[PDB]
Design a binder for this molecule. Sequence first.
Ligand SMILES: CCCCCCCC/C=C/CCCCCCCC(=O)OC[C@H](O)CO
Ligand SMILES: CCCCCCCC/C=C\CCCCCCCC(=O)OC[C@H](O)CO
Ligand SMILES: CCCCCCCC/C=C\CCCCCCCC(=O)OC[C@H](O)CO
Ligand SMILES: CCCCCCCC/C=C\CCCCCCCC(=O)OC[C@H](O)CO
Ligand SMILES: CCCCCCCC/C=C\CCCCCCCC(=O)OC[C@H](O)CO
Ligand SMILES: *C/C=C(C)/C=C/C=C(C)/C=C/C1=C(C)CCCC1(C)C
Length: 231
Amino acid sequence: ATGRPEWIWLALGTALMGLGTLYFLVKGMGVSDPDAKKFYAITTLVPAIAFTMYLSMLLGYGLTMVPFGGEQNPIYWARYADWLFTTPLLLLDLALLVDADQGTILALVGADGIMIGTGLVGALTKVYSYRFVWWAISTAAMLYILYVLFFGFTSKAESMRPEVASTFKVLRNVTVVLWSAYPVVWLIGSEGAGIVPLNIETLLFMVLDVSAKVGFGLILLRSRAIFGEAE
Ligand SMILES: CCCCCCCC/C=C/CCCCCCCC(=O)OC[C@H](O)CO
Ligand SMILES: CCCCCCCC/C=C\CCCCCCCC(=O)OC[C@H](O)CO
Ligand SMILES: CCCCCCCC/C=C\CCCCCCCC(=O)OC[C@H](O)CO
Ligand SMILES: CCCCCCCC/C=C\CCCCCCCC(=O)OC[C@H](O)CO
Ligand SMILES: CCCCCCCC/C=C\CCCCCCCC(=O)OC[C@H](O)CO
Ligand SMILES: *C/C=C(C)/C=C/C=C(C)/C=C/C1=C(C)CCCC1(C)C
C-alpha cells in the first residue's frame, strides 16, 4: 500500500468522501419535505459511491496494468466505475432544480454515459494513437452537456422562483469550470501524453473530485431552493 507514492492522496480522498457522506446523512435526518428528501438522497449517494471507489484504489483492487508505448502503465480503472454512477446523479440534481422536461434529462444522462464509457475504452486501449481518438469523442460528448446546461437550463431557470434561479446559476458555473478540467488532466497525465507524473495527477483528481462532490453538495443543501414553497 505505502509502496505507491500516490497512496497519501488516495487516503485523504477516502477520508474526505467518508466524512462528507456522514455529514450529509446526519443533516438529512428528519427532513420531511418530499422535494427536499429527493435532493438529500441524490446528493448523499454521490460521496458514498466515491468513498467506496477511493477505498478500492487505496487497497489496490481498482488498479490494473495496461501496456502501451513499450511500458506497463498503471491505470486506475475504478475512477470510471465511480464516475459512471456519480456524474449522472449530479446532472439529475441540476435538472430537478430547474424542472427539466423528461426528453432533456434522457439526452443529458445518455450523453454522460457515452462520455464516461468512451473515456474508459480510451484508458484501456493498447494502441497509443487510438487512445486520443476516444478522448476526442468523449470530449465532444462533454461539450454537448455543457451546451445544454447553458442554452437549455439557464433559459428555464430564469422563469422560476428567484432562489431557484440564483442557486442554479452558481451550481452551473461551479460545474462548468470543474468538469472542464478533467479532460485536460487526463490528456497531460499518465493516461495520455505522460507529462505530469501519476502522483501529481492523483492529487489533482482528488482536489477536483472533493470540490465537485462535497463542495457542490454543501452549496446545494444549504439553499432554500430544495424546499417546496410553503406557508
Ligand atoms: C482550498 C484550500 C486548499 C488549497 C489547495 C489547492 C492546491 C491544488 C494542488 C495543486 C498543484 C500543486 C502540485 C505540487 C507541485 C509539484 C511539482 C514539482 O515540484 O515537480 C518538481 C520536479 O521535481 C522538477 O520539475
Ligand atoms: C467512515 C464512514 C464511511 C462512510 C459511510 C459508508 C458508506 C457506505 C454505507 C452505507 C449507505 C448508507 C445510505 C446511503 C444512502 C443515503 C440516502 C439518504 O440520505 O436519503 C435521505 C432521504 O431523505 C431518505 O428518504
Ligand atoms: C441511482 C443509481 C445508484 C447506483 C448505485 C451503484 C453503486 C455501486 C457501488 C460500488 C461497487 C462497484 C463494483 C464494481 C465491480 C467491478 C468488478 C469487476 O468486474 O472486476 C473484474 C476483475 O475481477 C478485476 O479487474
Ligand atoms: C449507467 C448509467 C445510467 C444509470 C445511472 C443512474 C443515474 C440516474 C437515473 C436516471 C435518468 C433517467 C430519467 C430520470 C428523470 C425523471 C425525473 C422526472 O422527470 O420527474 C419524474 C417524477 O415522476 C416527477 O414527479
Ligand atoms: C470548453 C472547456 C473544455 C475544453 C477542453 C478541451 C481543451 C483542449 C486543449 C488543448 C490541447 C493542447 C495539447 C498540448 C499537448 C502537447 C504535449 C506534447 O506532446 O509536448 C511534450 C511536452 O510538452 C514536452 O515537455
Ligand atoms: C465526481 C466526479 C466528476 C464530476 C467527474 C467528472 C469527469 C469528467 C467530466 C470526465 C471527462 C473526460 C473527458 C471529457 C475526456 C477524457 C476522459 C474523461 C473521462 C476524464
